[PDB]
Amino acid sequence: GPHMATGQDRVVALVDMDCFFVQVEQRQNPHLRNKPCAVVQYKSWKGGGIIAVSYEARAFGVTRSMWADDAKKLCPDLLLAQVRESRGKANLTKYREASVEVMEIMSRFAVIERASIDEAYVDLTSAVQERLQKLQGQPISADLLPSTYIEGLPQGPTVQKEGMRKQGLFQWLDSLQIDNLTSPDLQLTVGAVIVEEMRAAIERETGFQCSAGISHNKVLAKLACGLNKPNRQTLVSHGSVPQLFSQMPIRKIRSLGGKLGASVIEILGIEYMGELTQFTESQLQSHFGEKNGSWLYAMCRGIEHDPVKPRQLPKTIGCSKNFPGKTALATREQVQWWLLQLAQELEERLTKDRNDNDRVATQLVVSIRVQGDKRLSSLRRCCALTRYDAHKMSHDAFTVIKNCNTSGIQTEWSPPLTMLFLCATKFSAS
DNA sequence: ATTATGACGCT
DNA sequence: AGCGTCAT
Ligand SMILES: Nc1ncnc2c1ncn2[C@H]1C[C@H](O)[C@@H](COP(=O)(O)OP(=O)(O)OP(=O)(O)O)O1
Ligand SMILES: [Ca+2]
Ligand code: NA
The missing domain is CATH 3.30.1490.100 (DNA polymerase, Y-family, little finger domain)
Known part of the structure; x- marks a missing residue:
């Protein structure tokens, strides 16, 4: 009841660049823009190994790890950019330097955690509080969220993608309590407005597009980010979790993609994240250890505390x-x-x-x-x-x-x- | 013959 | 310390 934590204490975002190495190469060479294209390393062995793939090329079935000779069988007009070679080896300097460009921009908005060469988590709790003070109870316009999806909506009593997005956004905004400065849903929404601003600044100043997730913790923000890629951002509220997790394969949650996730499935005889809620914290600790058990018990309820x-x-x-x-x-x-x-x-x-x-x-x-x-x-x-x-x-x-x-x-x-x-x-x- | 990274947990 | 897991 009143003492049951809901894990709605923070606003966290995960920003991830779209087909990152490809965009770096497309910025440099305009002939690659808006085309099926991939980045490859080495070339002598089967045309080189693919490490990044543009969304146009993914439509043909091109994937990471594929040899370029094989990719060309699926996509004969596939264009390629090669990773630099220095001292007889692949050299990723250009992408590390492009990463710094993006990370320095993000750092103007908030403290970031560099998660990979092209992903950062952002704790926006403080920035949101501030923006809420400026707003002074004033409602949030859909115009402030031009690329945002609200996971789970629309729902209840148009056949195009963008129309769906707007319908869901409208339902979400219509229901918001903008009068309460401590409403988690409101805080998330303001979080999303800030992320729209961060994403616009990244694109303006570097040319790179990205996706983002906005939620109450890192795992949900990461999951959210992938739901609507590329060039979009997704808000996953605490309330959306039961339905979202009800058909969410366990392996999709960060850290459960490997042997531990396989053992959760095998040992418990389940398939989806939501099915975890039926086990006690002690049951889960008994199978997967004290730390993993506690983490699972909270995570399947949408709760996680990793800073x-x-x-x-x-x-x-x-x-x-x-x-x-x-x-x-x-x-x-x-x-x-x-x-x-x-x-x-x-x-x-x-x-x-x-x-x-x-x-x-x-x-x-x-x-x-x-x-x-x-x-x-x-x-x-x-x-x-x-x-x-x-x-x-x-x-x-x-x-x-x-x-x-x-x-x-x-x-x-x-x-x-x-x-x-x-x-x-x-x-x-x- | 995927390859080149990078973070963190266990003992 | 040295090894393993999980991730991009
Ligand atoms: N397994 C890998 N080996 C070598 N480089 C990789 C590997 N995975 C990812 N990278 C590099 C190339 C990617 O452009 C970059 C970011 O990875 P990632 O976010 O997984 O995909 P992406 O940015 O290419 O596409 P997406 O739009 O799906 O995020 O890191
Ligand atoms: Ca990416
Ligand atoms: Na990434």
């Missing part, structure tokens, strides 16, 4: 390369040359990072994969990172891995290595 962490910069800076099949590194000289290639890219990114962000990394993590292991990483060792110098870092990386060499011969490397990875971590202010 938007104040962090705009990545916590680690890493460089990795696979050496598949026949290309696996089998000689000491090969291993040393590639460690250097990786180490040079890392030095370049670290030096830039130190000048930009007033910090220095203090630990170097080195990770390899050996031919045969099903696991992505086979071994991980750390050493001190005391100077930003590529030759030193590559020398140290070798030292910590060289005893992995099974070969009795000095010059040979066995088993051959199928992945090398260098990562700078443990930053300190400077």
Whole structure:
């Protein structure tokens, strides 16, 4: 009853760029705009691997992970942009730099949590309170929400997409209590008005379009964001949760896409998020552990407490390369040359990072994969990172891995290595 | 022969 | 510390 928390204490948004690497390439090369197009890395092996796909190309069935030669079978006029290659490896600098452009804009509106190269969570609780004071009980016009969907509406007693959207928006606004400054639904709505403003500023200042979700926590905001992509934003209210979750496959909720979600399904014999409500908190803790159990019990009711962490910069800076099949590194000289290639890219990114962000990394993590292991990483060792110098870092990386060499011969490397990875971590202010 | 990242939980 | 999970 009156003591039952409803998880309506915050307004949180998740903003995610549409087909991000594709938009970066389309901005740069206008010939790619408004066309079926994809971004690919490498090219020699089956035309390159696809990492991003424009919405026009998705209509033909083109997807991430697909080889470009295969994508062309579905979409013969597919256009391609290639990721930059430097020092013999893919270099993602252009996209990291485009990401900073977007993140700096978002940061004008509120504190953000950088969730990936093209996604940030925003805690808007404070900004909403403020805007509510300016409004002074004044109603919110649909004109302030020109790209917003209200999940679950319209409902109750036109056949076009935009007409539906407006009908739902109208029902939502018609029902709002604008007189109550602490109404969660009102707070969400003001949140959405602010996100429209953030999304317009992003598009104006960078050319990039995005989608967004607005709800009371990160998981719902993330789920909401995906409901109406591209170039749209979706509000998911606390009230919309029972119907939304009633047919929502468990794997769709962030963190349940893998083995834990599979076990929730198998152990409990259910399919949808809403079905979770029938288990006690202790039942769920008994199957999935204390932390997961509590999290599930609240989450299936639309409640989650994970904070938007104040962090705009990545916590680690890493460089990795696979050496598949026949290309696996089998000689000491090969291993040393590639460690250097990786180490040079890392030095370049670290030096830039130190000048930009007033910090220095203090630990170097080195990770390899050996031919045969099903696991992505086979071994991980750390050493001190005391100077930003590529030759030193590559020398140290070798030292910590060289005893992995099974070969009795000095010059040979066995088993051959199928992945090398260098990562700078443990930053300190400077 | 997906590849290149990046955050966080467990012991 | 080193490994695993989950994500983009
Ligand atoms: N598995 C991956 N391997 C390499 N790069 C990836 C991978 N997944 C995503 N990326 C890169 C390319 C994407 O443009 C960018 C953002 O990813 P993501 O948000 O999942 O898709 P997207 O932005 O391309 O399309 P969407 O409009 O569906 O969000 O990160
Ligand atoms: Ca995206
Ligand atoms: Na994303």
